[PDB]
Write an enzyme that holds these catalytic residues in place. Structure first.
Site, PDB file in Angstrom:
ATOM      1  N   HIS B 136       0.812  -1.205   0.000  1.00 39.57           N
ATOM      2  CA  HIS B 136       0.000   0.000   0.000  1.00 39.57           C
ATOM      3  C   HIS B 136       0.860   1.276   0.000  1.00 39.57           C
ATOM      4  N   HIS B 145      11.890   0.170 -12.751  1.00 44.05           N
ATOM      5  CA  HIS B 145      11.758  -1.267 -13.016  1.00 44.05           C
ATOM      6  C   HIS B 145      11.919  -2.021 -11.692  1.00 44.05           C
TER       7      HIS B 145
HETATM    8  C1  LIG Z   1      24.954  -5.879  -8.659  1.00 41.19           C
HETATM    9  C2  LIG Z   1      25.114  -5.991 -10.180  1.00 41.19           C
HETATM   10  C3  LIG Z   1      24.408  -4.820 -10.872  1.00 41.19           C
HETATM   11  C4  LIG Z   1      26.612  -5.993 -10.414  1.00 41.19           C
HETATM   12  O1  LIG Z   1      26.873  -6.026 -11.793  1.00 41.19           O
HETATM   13  P1  LIG Z   1      28.372  -5.896 -12.286  1.00 41.19           P
HETATM   14  O2  LIG Z   1      29.016  -4.721 -11.560  1.00 41.19           O
HETATM   15  O3  LIG Z   1      28.416  -6.135 -13.782  1.00 41.19           O
HETATM   16  O4  LIG Z   1      29.027  -7.048 -11.358  1.00 41.19           O
HETATM   17  P2  LIG Z   1      29.926  -8.306 -11.629  1.00 41.19           P
HETATM   18  O5  LIG Z   1      29.114  -9.508 -12.132  1.00 41.19           O
HETATM   19  O6  LIG Z   1      31.184  -7.940 -12.345  1.00 41.19           O
HETATM   20  O7  LIG Z   1      30.289  -8.551 -10.099  1.00 41.19           O
HETATM   21  C5  LIG Z   1      31.083  -7.481  -9.437  1.00 41.19           C
HETATM   22  C6  LIG Z   1      31.196  -8.042  -7.984  1.00 41.19           C
HETATM   23  O8  LIG Z   1      29.901  -7.884  -7.290  1.00 41.19           O
HETATM   24  C7  LIG Z   1      29.487  -9.070  -6.575  1.00 41.19           C
HETATM   25  N1  LIG Z   1      28.017  -9.169  -6.808  1.00 41.19           N
HETATM   26  C8  LIG Z   1      27.478  -9.177  -8.008  1.00 41.19           C
HETATM   27  N2  LIG Z   1      26.150  -9.108  -7.892  1.00 41.19           N
HETATM   28  C9  LIG Z   1      25.836  -9.071  -6.571  1.00 41.19           C
HETATM   29  C10 LIG Z   1      24.620  -9.047  -5.850  1.00 41.19           C
HETATM   30  N3  LIG Z   1      23.430  -8.969  -6.480  1.00 41.19           N
HETATM   31  N4  LIG Z   1      24.670  -9.043  -4.528  1.00 41.19           N
HETATM   32  C11 LIG Z   1      25.883  -9.079  -3.924  1.00 41.19           C
HETATM   33  N5  LIG Z   1      27.084  -9.111  -4.554  1.00 41.19           N
HETATM   34  C12 LIG Z   1      27.000  -9.113  -5.883  1.00 41.19           C
HETATM   35  C13 LIG Z   1      30.294 -10.142  -7.260  1.00 41.19           C
HETATM   36  O9  LIG Z   1      30.365 -11.340  -6.484  1.00 41.19           O
HETATM   37  C14 LIG Z   1      31.587  -9.497  -7.661  1.00 41.19           C
HETATM   38  O10 LIG Z   1      32.371  -9.615  -6.478  1.00 41.19           O
HETATM   39  P3  LIG Z   1      34.010  -9.673  -6.529  1.00 41.19           P
HETATM   40  O11 LIG Z   1      34.517  -8.254  -6.831  1.00 41.19           O
HETATM   41  O12 LIG Z   1      34.279 -10.389  -5.186  1.00 41.19           O
HETATM   42  O13 LIG Z   1      34.398 -10.551  -7.729  1.00 41.19           O
HETATM   43  C15 LIG Z   1      24.487  -7.281 -10.769  1.00 41.19           C
HETATM   44  O14 LIG Z   1      25.258  -8.449 -10.433  1.00 41.19           O
HETATM   45  C16 LIG Z   1      23.074  -7.592 -10.440  1.00 41.19           C
HETATM   46  O15 LIG Z   1      22.679  -8.006  -9.328  1.00 41.19           O
HETATM   47  N6  LIG Z   1      22.196  -7.310 -11.421  1.00 41.19           N
HETATM   48  C17 LIG Z   1      20.741  -7.422 -11.212  1.00 41.19           C
HETATM   49  C18 LIG Z   1      20.277  -8.104 -12.475  1.00 41.19           C
HETATM   50  C19 LIG Z   1      18.871  -8.539 -12.430  1.00 41.19           C
HETATM   51  O16 LIG Z   1      18.394  -8.971 -11.399  1.00 41.19           O
HETATM   52  N7  LIG Z   1      18.203  -8.523 -13.576  1.00 41.19           N
HETATM   53  C20 LIG Z   1      16.805  -8.900 -13.616  1.00 41.19           C
HETATM   54  C21 LIG Z   1      16.359  -8.383 -14.952  1.00 41.19           C
HETATM   55  S1  LIG Z   1      14.612  -8.441 -15.062  1.00 41.19           S
HETATM   56  C1  LIG Z   2       2.761  -3.813   4.149  1.00 45.39           C
HETATM   57  C2  LIG Z   2       3.080  -2.894   5.332  1.00 45.39           C
HETATM   58  O1  LIG Z   2       4.259  -2.405   5.311  1.00 45.39           O
HETATM   59  N1  LIG Z   2       2.051  -2.826   6.205  1.00 45.39           N
HETATM   60  C3  LIG Z   2       2.321  -2.181   7.530  1.00 45.39           C
HETATM   61  C4  LIG Z   2       2.002  -0.679   7.418  1.00 45.39           C
HETATM   62  O2  LIG Z   2       2.905  -0.073   6.457  1.00 45.39           O
HETATM   63  C5  LIG Z   2       2.162  -0.017   8.821  1.00 45.39           C
HETATM   64  O3  LIG Z   2       3.543   0.014   9.312  1.00 45.39           O
HETATM   65  C6  LIG Z   2       1.342  -0.739   9.797  1.00 45.39           C
HETATM   66  O4  LIG Z   2      -0.047  -0.531   9.469  1.00 45.39           O
HETATM   67  P1  LIG Z   2      -1.079   0.000  10.529  1.00 45.39           P
HETATM   68  O5  LIG Z   2      -2.240   0.350   9.685  1.00 45.39           O
HETATM   69  O6  LIG Z   2      -1.311  -0.777  11.731  1.00 45.39           O
HETATM   70  O7  LIG Z   2      -0.369   1.351  11.044  1.00 45.39           O
HETATM   71  P2  LIG Z   2      -0.743   2.900  10.827  1.00 45.39           P
HETATM   72  O8  LIG Z   2      -0.842   3.201   9.319  1.00 45.39           O
HETATM   73  O9  LIG Z   2       0.227   3.651  11.632  1.00 45.39           O
HETATM   74  O10 LIG Z   2      -2.185   3.000  11.447  1.00 45.39           O
HETATM   75  C7  LIG Z   2      -2.492   2.513  12.804  1.00 45.39           C
HETATM   76  C8  LIG Z   2      -3.909   3.028  13.031  1.00 45.39           C
HETATM   77  O11 LIG Z   2      -4.348   2.345  14.226  1.00 45.39           O
HETATM   78  C9  LIG Z   2      -5.017   3.298  15.060  1.00 45.39           C
HETATM   79  N2  LIG Z   2      -4.987   2.766  16.416  1.00 45.39           N
HETATM   80  C10 LIG Z   2      -3.887   2.576  17.208  1.00 45.39           C
HETATM   81  N3  LIG Z   2      -4.226   2.111  18.456  1.00 45.39           N
HETATM   82  C11 LIG Z   2      -5.550   1.864  18.388  1.00 45.39           C
HETATM   83  C12 LIG Z   2      -6.455   1.330  19.290  1.00 45.39           C
HETATM   84  O12 LIG Z   2      -6.151   1.061  20.471  1.00 45.39           O
HETATM   85  N4  LIG Z   2      -7.716   1.247  18.856  1.00 45.39           N
HETATM   86  C13 LIG Z   2      -8.156   1.681  17.644  1.00 45.39           C
HETATM   87  N5  LIG Z   2      -9.479   1.587  17.397  1.00 45.39           N
HETATM   88  N6  LIG Z   2      -7.325   2.207  16.762  1.00 45.39           N
HETATM   89  C14 LIG Z   2      -6.034   2.298  17.141  1.00 45.39           C
HETATM   90  C15 LIG Z   2      -4.226   4.614  14.829  1.00 45.39           C
HETATM   91  O13 LIG Z   2      -4.965   5.715  15.309  1.00 45.39           O
HETATM   92  C16 LIG Z   2      -4.006   4.520  13.306  1.00 45.39           C
HETATM   93  O14 LIG Z   2      -5.019   5.166  12.505  1.00 45.39           O
HETATM   94  O15 LIG Z   2       1.486  -2.161   9.799  1.00 45.39           O
HETATM   95  C17 LIG Z   2       1.461  -2.873   8.632  1.00 45.39           C
HETATM   96  C18 LIG Z   2       1.783  -4.349   8.836  1.00 45.39           C
HETATM   97  C1  LIG Z   3      13.266 -11.137 -16.718  1.00 47.50           C
HETATM   98  C2  LIG Z   3      14.502 -10.598 -17.444  1.00 47.50           C
HETATM   99  O1  LIG Z   3      15.609 -11.040 -16.990  1.00 47.50           O
HETATM  100  N1  LIG Z   3      14.169  -9.704 -18.401  1.00 47.50           N
HETATM  101  C3  LIG Z   3      15.283  -8.904 -19.006  1.00 47.50           C
HETATM  102  C4  LIG Z   3      15.813  -9.656 -20.240  1.00 47.50           C
HETATM  103  O2  LIG Z   3      16.380 -10.923 -19.815  1.00 47.50           O
HETATM  104  C5  LIG Z   3      16.891  -8.779 -20.948  1.00 47.50           C
HETATM  105  O3  LIG Z   3      18.118  -8.595 -20.168  1.00 47.50           O
HETATM  106  C6  LIG Z   3      16.328  -7.458 -21.240  1.00 47.50           C
HETATM  107  O4  LIG Z   3      15.293  -7.612 -22.234  1.00 47.50           O
HETATM  108  P1  LIG Z   3      15.289  -6.774 -23.563  1.00 47.50           P
HETATM  109  O5  LIG Z   3      14.274  -7.479 -24.372  1.00 47.50           O
HETATM  110  O6  LIG Z   3      15.220  -5.328 -23.480  1.00 47.50           O
HETATM  111  O7  LIG Z   3      16.753  -7.081 -24.161  1.00 47.50           O
HETATM  112  P2  LIG Z   3      17.224  -7.938 -25.437  1.00 47.50           P
HETATM  113  O8  LIG Z   3      16.665  -9.370 -25.332  1.00 47.50           O
HETATM  114  O9  LIG Z   3      18.678  -7.754 -25.515  1.00 47.50           O
HETATM  115  O10 LIG Z   3      16.501  -7.210 -26.630  1.00 47.50           O
HETATM  116  C7  LIG Z   3      16.601  -5.755 -26.839  1.00 47.50           C
HETATM  117  C8  LIG Z   3      15.950  -5.568 -28.205  1.00 47.50           C
HETATM  118  O11 LIG Z   3      15.779  -4.139 -28.323  1.00 47.50           O
HETATM  119  C9  LIG Z   3      16.168  -3.754 -29.648  1.00 47.50           C
HETATM  120  N2  LIG Z   3      16.486  -2.334 -29.599  1.00 47.50           N
HETATM  121  C10 LIG Z   3      17.522  -1.739 -28.929  1.00 47.50           C
HETATM  122  N3  LIG Z   3      17.562  -0.383 -29.147  1.00 47.50           N
HETATM  123  C11 LIG Z   3      16.442  -0.108 -29.845  1.00 47.50           C
HETATM  124  C12 LIG Z   3      15.888   1.075 -30.306  1.00 47.50           C
HETATM  125  O12 LIG Z   3      16.471   2.174 -30.213  1.00 47.50           O
HETATM  126  N4  LIG Z   3      14.743   0.945 -30.983  1.00 47.50           N
HETATM  127  C13 LIG Z   3      14.136  -0.237 -31.275  1.00 47.50           C
HETATM  128  N5  LIG Z   3      13.022  -0.190 -32.034  1.00 47.50           N
HETATM  129  N6  LIG Z   3      14.642  -1.386 -30.863  1.00 47.50           N
HETATM  130  C14 LIG Z   3      15.788  -1.313 -30.157  1.00 47.50           C
HETATM  131  C15 LIG Z   3      17.350  -4.705 -29.979  1.00 47.50           C
HETATM  132  O13 LIG Z   3      17.615  -4.686 -31.363  1.00 47.50           O
HETATM  133  C16 LIG Z   3      16.803  -6.017 -29.380  1.00 47.50           C
HETATM  134  O14 LIG Z   3      16.073  -6.849 -30.308  1.00 47.50           O
HETATM  135  O15 LIG Z   3      15.666  -6.810 -20.151  1.00 47.50           O
HETATM  136  C17 LIG Z   3      14.762  -7.482 -19.377  1.00 47.50           C
HETATM  137  C18 LIG Z   3      14.287  -6.662 -18.182  1.00 47.50           C
END
Ligand SMILES: CC(C)(COP(=O)(O)OP(=O)(O)OC[C@H]1O[C@@H](n2cnc3c(N)ncnc32)[C@H](O)[C@@H]1OP(=O)(O)O)[C@@H](O)C(=O)NCCC(=O)NCCS
Ligand SMILES: CC(=O)N[C@H]1[C@H](O)[C@H](O)[C@@H](OP(=O)(O)OP(=O)(O)OC[C@H]2O[C@@H](n3cnc4c(=O)[nH]c(N)nc43)[C@H](O)[C@@H]2O)O[C@@H]1C
Ligand SMILES: CC(=O)N[C@H]1[C@H](O)[C@H](O)[C@@H](OP(=O)(O)OP(=O)(O)OC[C@H]2O[C@@H](n3cnc4c(=O)[nH]c(N)nc43)[C@H](O)[C@@H]2O)O[C@@H]1C
Ligand SMILES: CC(C)(COP(=O)(O)OP(=O)(O)OC[C@H]1O[C@@H](n2cnc3c(N)ncnc32)[C@H](O)[C@@H]1OP(=O)(O)O)[C@@H](O)C(=O)NCCC(=O)NCCS
Ligand SMILES: CC(C)(COP(=O)(O)OP(=O)(O)OC[C@H]1O[C@@H](n2cnc3c(N)ncnc32)[C@H](O)[C@@H]1OP(=O)(O)O)[C@@H](O)C(=O)NCCC(=O)NCCS
Ligand SMILES: CC(=O)N[C@H]1[C@H](O)[C@H](O)[C@@H](OP(=O)(O)OP(=O)(O)OC[C@H]2O[C@@H](n3cnc4c(=O)[nH]c(N)nc43)[C@H](O)[C@@H]2O)O[C@@H]1C
Ligand SMILES: [Cl-]
Ligand SMILES: [Cl-]
Ligand SMILES: [Cl-]
Ligand SMILES: [Cl-]
Ligand SMILES: [Cl-]
Ligand SMILES: [Cl-]
Lengths: 207, 207, 207
Positions: B136, B145
């Site tokens: 919420h 993203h």
């Molecule tokens: C954090 C991140 C951005 C780093 O990318 P990068 O800088 O190209 O990193 P590298 O793969 O070269 O790793 C650099 C270092 O970071 C550490 N590391 C990498 N990703 C990490 C993560 N998510 N959490 C903690 N440590 C991480 C590596 O172990 C490496 O450590 P080292 O210096 O001991 O070798 C990337 O790993 C990541 O998490 N990307 C998110 C991708 C994702 O979830 N995509 C979903 C798409 S929908």
């Molecule tokens: C997904 C998430 O992060 N959810 C959290 C949320 O972000 C909040 O941290 C928290 O939600 P909650 O709704 O309990 O907190 P808050 O938004 O602060 O609202 C508490 C409400 O309870 C009311 N209230 C507190 N004591 C009492 C009480 O004694 N009686 C009555 N009738 N109401 C009371 C208070 O006035 C307020 O409007 O708890 C949730 C688990």
């Molecule tokens: C769940 C997940 O990991 N999803 C990732 C996925 O795995 C990829 O890392 C990435 O997906 P995306 O589809 O953007 O990347 P890729 O598969 O590399 O495709 C990019 C496409 O964009 C095209 N493209 C890049 N620049 C442009 C541009 O300027 N215009 C147009 N029309 N197309 C473009 C390119 O030619 C290619 O076919 O991003 C996502 C968030």
């Protein structure tokens, strides 16, 4: 051993079986019987151990699911079931979202709340457990297990019999070898070889 | 370049586009064509690069989605599409749960398995990726993203073009600046400024 | 204080209440009124503080939900509501998947996107928040809170009033004591006693 006409036979009668039974029933399937190495589970009779499989086949039952968590054992029991003339069904909860371009094998479990995206391939006997996410273009090898609430980003490959613990995550394009284990919560940021254990954020191999 | 009457034009033909196409089709929409910088994707023809946009508009197509993962580029291409006379549609998978008090922008992707709760605001061109949770009273800036399986607790603000990797988490009330990256699995427990990278449990800025 | 015939009374008018109201409405329920210690929320009138409960009961309202995040306080207000003659309803979003063998208490919140598997038991006044996963054979004590995107593997026990932060994970068979807090992202790999805080991957008690 008196049974109804037509249902699914389950190998395994443990906790995983309970969840599988419920997925099957949610789809409208009937579960006929369980075979368990200790020879009822949610109302399904346990009728014997695996020696009862010929008997079941002879009485007309031909559809089977292997509800065994251990990946190597599951794979072995799937082969045994097929040798005995059973077809391996899938157990896919109706709440799971499976993209129309996903390729599914046989004997696959897909639990409630799962999402599997475009052009992913799911090998025979895989488990995609509760709430797990498989993004586009993933490749899941036979008998692997993605644990509850695990997530693969795009283009991830998971080897045969690999296991990802609850809440494990894998970044795009990574490959994980066969027989590897990722601990609960592990965040995999580089390819993993076969037959290792990796834990942590980021995940690191533990000797 | 011969096309049907009425569908959605897609900018981008990569992996992200595949998922978007499937969300659109799951809603009953027709995808008319792709423009890609390399001038078919799941059966949708690639008809040229972005120079083909005037041609498409002239032939009566007026609805468009920008399926480009890179946040800055997506934002730029959205502006270009609007300048060319296209309206930006949303691509919201039918399995996503979007609360009735959520405010949605245009050009927003919401993947399978998402939940977005009460009084959250979602800026134009945001991506809420597969299985992500937005609790919420959140505020998501334009072109941010939230990666697969990421989660925001209540009252979180995410700046324009920020990116949260797979499985990132943010605790209540935190603000994350524009252009910031949270690595996969990062757990954000304090406000983050603009233009930083933060990784780890808890997340820490990496220079 | 003029109200319609028949709806649900809400204790609490904060952010959590907003989400609960939307779950109730998604099920077709009517929300009659809020009592809040500051004496409208998504169109529901705030009619007073808890001193207004007798008045509400006398006018025929008899169904109530406690929408208070704080676990100890929620538990106390549930008892007060019951003493005043109210029945505690459940607020279960229709998108949640609750297995047919789950045992549910009263006054339970189950948010969008949740999955709860076979033979789990959910105590009165628990919160299973947005996107959380509860696998088979779990035991959730009264007034505990599983935060958004948290996950319990099989056979986990959670004590009364315990709290698991956003994205916490628990491996199979673990027991967590009453009044314990697991920080956001914590990965629990061993039993936790009562009244502790544990953080990290893996989670460690912080003195
Ligand atoms: C954090 C991140 C951005 C780093 O990318 P990068 O800088 O190209 O990193 P590298 O793969 O070269 O790793 C650099 C270092 O970071 C550490 N590391 C990498 N990703 C990490 C993560 N998510 N959490 C903690 N440590 C991480 C590596 O172990 C490496 O450590 P080292 O210096 O001991 O070798 C990337 O790993 C990541 O998490 N990307 C998110 C991708 C994702 O979830 N995509 C979903 C798409 S929908
Ligand atoms: C997904 C998430 O992060 N959810 C959290 C949320 O972000 C909040 O941290 C928290 O939600 P909650 O709704 O309990 O907190 P808050 O938004 O602060 O609202 C508490 C409400 O309870 C009311 N209230 C507190 N004591 C009492 C009480 O004694 N009686 C009555 N009738 N109401 C009371 C208070 O006035 C307020 O409007 O708890 C949730 C688990
Ligand atoms: C769940 C997940 O990991 N999803 C990732 C996925 O795995 C990829 O890392 C990435 O997906 P995306 O589809 O953007 O990347 P890729 O598969 O590399 O495709 C990019 C496409 O964009 C095209 N493209 C890049 N620049 C442009 C541009 O300027 N215009 C147009 N029309 N197309 C473009 C390119 O030619 C290619 O076919 O991003 C996502 C968030
Ligand atoms: C990693 C794992 C395989 C280790 O199992 P194990 O070797 O029997 O480990 P132990 O419980 O003896 O713990 C060994 C050590 O690893 C650490 N540890 C355990 N699990 C860890 C995890 N997931 N992440 C980080 N550290 C972990 C422990 O704290 C302990 O540390 P210590 O030497 O300081 O005492 C296991 O804990 C795990 O994560 N299993 C995944 C289970 C799962 O998610 N099942 C879902 C079924 S659907
Ligand atoms: C763990 C937690 C309870 C600590 O709260 P707090 O004691 O007020 O902590 P602070 O914000 O002052 O941080 C204290 C320290 O803990 C560290 N920390 C905070 N939260 C952490 C977490 N979840 N994991 C690891 N470290 C954490 C901080 O980095 C800080 O470290 P420092 O001493 O190096 O500065 C809290 O940060 C948290 O995780 N709350 C969960 C909230 C939640 O998920 N709500 C969802 C509601 S539905
Ligand atoms: C979400 C979760 O944590 N699920 C776990 C669950 O918590 C368990 O750790 C585990 O479930 P599984 O059901 O496999 O384990 P268990 O509950 O121990 O039951 C195994 C069953 O398999 C039976 N069994 C073992 N070997 C064989 C065998 O060779 N053949 C047959 N027919 N049955 C066998 C055994 O007798 C027992 O009833 O694996 C799952 C992945
Ligand atoms: Cl049955
Ligand atoms: Cl390593
Ligand atoms: Cl189409
Ligand atoms: Cl920092
Ligand atoms: Cl109402
Ligand atoms: Cl400890």
């Amino acid at each position: 051993a008196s049974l109804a006409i037509g249902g699914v036979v389950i190998i395994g009668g443990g906790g995983h079986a309970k969840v599988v039974i419920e997925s099957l029933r949610a789809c409208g399937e009937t579960v006929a019987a369980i075979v368990d190495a200790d020879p009822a589970v949610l109302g399904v009779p346990v009728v014997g151990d695996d020696l009862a499989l010929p008997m079941l086949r002879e009485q007309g039952l031909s559809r089977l699911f292997v509800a065994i968590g251990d990946n190597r054992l599951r794979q072995k029991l799937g082969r045994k079931a097929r040798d005995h003339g059973f077809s391996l069904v899938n157990a896919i909860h109706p709440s799971a979202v499976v993209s129309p371009s996903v390729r599914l094998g046989e004997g696959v479990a897909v639990m409630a709340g799962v999402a599997i995206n475009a052009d992913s391939w799911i090998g025979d006997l895989a488990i995609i457990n509760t709430g797990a996410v498989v993004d586009h273009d993933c490749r899941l090898g036979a008998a692997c297990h993605l644990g509850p609430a695990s997530a693969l980003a795009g283009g991830v490959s998971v080897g045969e019999r690999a296991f990802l613990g609850v809440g494990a995550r894998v970044i795009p394009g990574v490959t994980i070898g066969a027989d590897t284990i990722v601990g609960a919560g592990g965040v995999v940021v580089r390819d993993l070889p076969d037959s290792v254990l990796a834990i942590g954020v980021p995940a690191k191999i533990k000797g």
